[PDB]
Design an enzyme around this catalytic site. Structure first.
Site, short mmCIF file in Angstrom:
data_model
loop_
_atom_site.label_atom_id
_atom_site.label_comp_id
_atom_site.label_asym_id
_atom_site.label_seq_id
_atom_site.Cartn_x
_atom_site.Cartn_y
_atom_site.Cartn_z
N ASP A 58 45.49 -26.80 -0.70
CA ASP A 58 45.00 -25.48 -1.20
C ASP A 58 45.62 -24.76 -1.54
O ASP A 58 45.33 -23.40 -0.85
CB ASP A 58 43.50 -25.19 -0.60
CG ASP A 58 42.28 -24.45 -0.62
OD1 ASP A 58 42.06 -24.48 -2.43
OD2 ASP A 58 42.32 -23.74 -0.45
N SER A 71 37.38 -16.96 0.39
CA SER A 71 38.38 -17.41 0.42
C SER A 71 39.52 -17.25 -0.46
O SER A 71 39.46 -16.38 -0.85
CB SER A 71 37.43 -18.86 -0.79
OG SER A 71 36.69 -19.51 -0.19
N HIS A 75 41.66 -23.37 -4.78
CA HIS A 75 39.72 -23.21 -5.76
C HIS A 75 39.82 -21.78 -6.22
O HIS A 75 38.72 -22.04 -6.83
CB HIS A 75 39.44 -24.20 -5.30
CG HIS A 75 39.17 -22.83 -3.24
ND1 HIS A 75 39.20 -22.74 -2.32
CD2 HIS A 75 38.33 -21.52 -3.96
CE1 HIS A 75 39.02 -22.76 -1.57
NE2 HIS A 75 37.70 -21.81 -1.74
#
Lengths: 57, 259, 35, 36, 256, 55, 257, 57, 36
Positions: G99, G205, G43
């Site tokens: 992910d 992230s 992502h």
């Protein structure tokens, strides 16, 4: 030449050149009687101006 | 000059004074346009109503002066006239039309910081500057006012006076008087609404009406003090000879009678 | 020759000296403005 | 004579070049260096 | 320019006018720095949120002007641009950081009494003139008033306006705007507590902030009118691109 | 450019450029939906400049 | 990182900063797994709803940093990307499953006292370590608070943040969110009554959740900061991608092509 | 990615991806319009994944 | 050994190689037993 200050006084009768009478400027071609200018200011020739001179080509 | 101030040394190196030999007197003002030619208003030399008819041998051309009386020993040069040319269409009757004349000097003058010619308008300069509102500068030793208290002397300035005046629109000059106004004349002076004022006067006649070109930093002569009603009068305006229109003739005489 | 005016309009004491007489500017300001 | 380009930059022909000062100019100079 | 006065004839020969061809509209101010190089704020050319990205052919530059509308015939000089050079790290998304841009003229404009280049600062002078309190000069043809929808004013000035504004110490600038300030910027303006007031406004963007070095009687360009909040609001100050800091880039696009 | 005058208003959401929302000014990366500006600024700029070099 | 602390110089030599060219901004964190291979979350390179979809030529890789903003001249290395390999089963649609992503540097990074690769876990170091209660370390220059207040403090950190979170039992992870969990994920974070708190947050992230095997003192990367609900919320737990599982893919694409 | 905060704004109706509605999270398919959603998300599955095709090396 | 190349990963040159303990480290080790 500065008019109005009576520096150029008009001769009794028909002024041949523009001038001042009482306090009024009588244009060439009018007659003034003391403090009064009456007439019809239309002189200085009636024929329009033109060009000629000796510049022969 | 009415409502003016004293000029600066050398701020008008073209100003010429027409002096009468005998009796000694200031006749008119004039402008140097070359080293052997002086431009002035014809009426100074010829005006029958005032028995005026001068011969070149009756006048002296004083160049480079500042003091209206002091003999500027090594500053002012005096030249004698060789010949005089009054415009052939000089209409001293009806309206003083084409009030302009040229005087040639017997000997060419040597310019200096005090003696220098003014430029005649070319065309673009003329069309650009001659407009309602633009200001011009008049210089002269003429009477300080129309009439004043005696005592001191009723007038007569001690040093060259100068005053800047705006060009007035044709209809206005025309409506300000009854004398037939021609295309060879314009007027300058402040409208009654502006608290600022000033005007030429007796003795300033013949003096230049110079303007300064923004496009080139040079001083050009736009008019010649001709006539007016009184001096600095409320409502009246002084009229100057429209030089640029007579330019054709000025050149002609110059070219055939010299160079 | 005599008439030339190559320096006409240029005052020696002012224009040639980058000096302006007191009222000189008043003309310039009467020009570029329009009021 | 040398340098590079417009050495006479920042010098206004209608003021500095003729020793003239615009009205408010002084106002600027004072802030930089004033008396007491 | 809010609370200003008409500039004297020729009291600002470096002032330039960025004119859009069609429609005819005044976009920004600029300043002559070299006979063919003009300087202006980047946002005058590129600012996306307003669909602004002027190609080097969309504009016109009128140099040496005093009147805003009239065409000063043999006085002004209208020149075309060859190429626009906007600063690389120009950050229009965040706070107009590095809001500087150069424009090259098609032909070097001959200087006159009304057209003259300003000197760019140098370390020395820059360090000596940029101080809180010291006043600077702003010039431009932009809005005379913020003109709120009620305050009836004349809006557009007739002649070039000039105003003198004091430089403000960094922290006060920092403390006045919620926008992040950077070293490439400095603010000027009068503090609320003082009497005098004035500021640049819409239309003045790109205009030069100049100061006169009392070390050699010359005008140096210190800033470019960049951004601000409203116009002449109590407390808010105007921000100017800190020209000197970008001199390296300004020089780099030329150099030798 | 001058903010505060609604000349540079931004749409709803992640305001991609400093804008004038309602009356307040939103910053890059922040967000607003008419009734005030909410969110945390990005930032860009804070990051010291650099240029990758070697030979 | 919410509720973390400034890291020690060189305590996480694999922590990489995924930097954006223009505009300049922090995108995500990542981990150096080799001299030219970096591991990150998918992502951070692809996620349609925010319009995120980058190309190798628009990103930068800052390795060996410490200060979030300052150009650490002689210390850090900034490389360009050659090719970005995203997992063909990145479910950004509903699960944020798988992910994960790998990026290959154009040129190998010379290792130093500040730059060193983390080890990928093997089939058994994984099994022994990935167990409810065992604590792991999450690092990153991300937000300090879910939504921070300015003035009397800031929000974005100054220097790299470190925090230790305990792996949480599967069932609780499931019962904490409405978002369907999968075997390719695991969650960590303290339970409400435990008292201690902390969790990665926006900007973290792609960051590594690493642990230390008592068997050899090596630092293994068990998880990757993926998604979560808020930041440091009482009741939620952060979800990290299960590296050990997707390893089969990573090793495959490491032989590339 | 962080939900709950609202960084992932949701389109009214359809919701092509698991988004953030008002505050409650709305899984793919569960059409949002501020006041929660259908309650029923989907698609969905319960069969265990498998491999039976060539695509890799 | 095999693997995929050089076996030096996970060893911080500023800690592991220098036999040093970073603050938090000790906490991770205690988590492997303590609790039950």
């Amino acid at each position: 030449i500065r008019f109005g200050m009576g520096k150029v006084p008009c001769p009794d009768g028909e002024v041949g050149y523009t001038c001042d009478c009482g306090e009024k400027i009588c244009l060439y071609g009018q007659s003034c009687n003391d403090g009064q200018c009456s007439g019809d200011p239309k002189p200085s020739s009636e024929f329009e101006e033109f060009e000629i001179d000796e510049e022969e080509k | 000059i009415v409502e003016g101030s004293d000029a600066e040394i050398g701020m008008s190196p073209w100003q010429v004074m027409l002096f009468r030999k005998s009796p000694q007197e200031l006749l008119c003002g004039a402008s140097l346009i070359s080293d052997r030619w002086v431009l002035t208003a014809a009426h100074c030399l010829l005006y029958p109503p005032w028995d005026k008819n001068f011969i070149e041998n009756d006048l002296l051309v004083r160049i480079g002066k500042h003091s209206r009386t002091r003999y500027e020993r090594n500053i002012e040069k005096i030249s004698m006239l060789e010949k005089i040319y009054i415009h052939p269409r000089y209409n001293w009757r009806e309206n003083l039309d084409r009030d302009i004349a040229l005087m040639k000097l017997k000997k060419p003058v040597a310019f200096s910081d005090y003696i220098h010619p003014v430029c005649l308008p070319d065309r673009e300069t003329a069309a650009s500057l001659l407009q309602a509102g633009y200001k011009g500068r008049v210089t002269g030793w003429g009477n300080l006012k129309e009439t004043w208290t005696a005592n001191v002397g009723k007038g007569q300035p001690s040093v060259l006076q100068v005053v800047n005046l705006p060009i007035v629109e044709r209809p206005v000059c025309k409506d300000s008087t009854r004398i037939r106004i021609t295309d060879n004349m314009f007027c300058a002076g402040y409208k009654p609404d502006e608290g600022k004022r000033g005007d030429a006067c007796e003795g300033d006649s013949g003096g230049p009406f110079v303007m300064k070109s923004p496009f080139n930093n040079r001083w050009y002569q736009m008019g010649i003090v001709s006539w007016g009603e009184g001096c600095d009068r409320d409502g009246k305006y002084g009229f100057y000879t429209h030089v640029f229109r007579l330019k054709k003739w000025i050149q002609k005489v110059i070219d055939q009678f010299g160079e | 020759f005599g008439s030339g005016e190559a320096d006409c309009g240029l005052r020696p004491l002012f224009e040639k000296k980058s000096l302006e007489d007191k009222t000189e500017r008043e003309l310039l300001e009467s020009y570029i403005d329009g009021r």
